[PDB]
């Protein structure tokens, strides 16, 4: 039984970063050549693991996180990064083991008029913990005190990406998939094609 990476990388719709989505990949044969033989990836890099050697490895479990970010924000999807994406939307652990893949999706995520369906959080009281997710949409106050706009000093915590088919590449939309490699003291559930 092949691991369902197609369902992940080829999903018709992708979520916003702040509402990032995780699929558990487990108990299956991972044929990573599907990512080798597709040559559209503009980010493809791994931590604790050689990117080209994935078919030779077994993992306890693989987690696939999908979301969309601005081109210039892709770099925040790494261990130890700072910034509003990495501190308020999606944070990888210092000791991350896995891979980050990204590809330019101008032709399906951007528009002449501008696509504003994709959002990120930019106001928050305290940074996210690694792999933590915050999908609330609560008026934000620097007092921390609850507030009801139009009250003063009361702000909305999300903001839109505006994805236009005519901007520079750093502003165009990128679909991101993070693969987390879990290592436990047991048999492995996700192995490569000829490993058992």
């Amino acid at each position, epitope marked *: 039984n092949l691991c369902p990476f197609g369902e992940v990388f080829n999903a018709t719709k992708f979520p916003s970063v702040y509402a990032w989505e995780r699929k558990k990949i487990s108990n299956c044969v991972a044929d990573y050549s599907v990512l080798y033989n597709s040559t559209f990836f503009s980010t493809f890099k791994c*931590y604790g693991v050689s990117a080209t050697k994935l078919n030779d490895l077994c993992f306890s479990n693989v987690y696939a996180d999908s979301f969309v970010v601005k081109g210039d924000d892709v*770099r925040q999807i790494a261990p130890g990064q700072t910034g509003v994406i990495a501190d308020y939307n999606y944070k990888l652990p210092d*000791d*991350f083991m896995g891979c980050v893949l990204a590809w330019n999706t101008r032709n399906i995520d951007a528009t002449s008029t501008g696509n504003y369906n994709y959002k990120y959080r930019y106001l928050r009281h305290g940074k996210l913990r690694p792999f933590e997710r915050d999908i609330s949409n609560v008026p934000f106050s620097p007092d921390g005190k609850p507030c009801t706009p139009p009250a003063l000093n009361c702000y909305w915590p999300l903001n839109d990406y505006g994805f236009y088919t005519t901007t520079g590449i750093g502003y165009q939309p990128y679909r991101v998939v993070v693969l987390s490699f879990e290592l436990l003291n047991a048999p492995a559930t996700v192995c490569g094609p000829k490993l058992s």
Partner: nanobody
Amino acid sequence: QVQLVESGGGLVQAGGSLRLSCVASGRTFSRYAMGWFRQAPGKEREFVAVIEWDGGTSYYVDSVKGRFTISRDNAKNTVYLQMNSLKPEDTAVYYCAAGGNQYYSATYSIWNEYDFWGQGTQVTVSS
């Protein structure tokens, strides 16, 4: 955040040798491919060398093949750049960089493709 501190730079006569070191903080050093870049006067940061997380694969810019050799010690959180047969062309600030193990080797030579960067150590090779 992982911090990178270079050392071993300094002043050396043409024909001589230096050995640069870069120490990372934390315990996560062995996840990363470790690179060296350099910046000569009037030039962009240029790739010099990389070694992957496990020490087994490594690449060099052509102008240093056979003179420079990169190595690492995951036990000491330290990447090394052995520099022989130095020439004035090697005069530059040498920067350590930490990033992911890349699927395309060419990506290793793009400074912006790494995750962390040192503040550099100066190397001057006098004629």
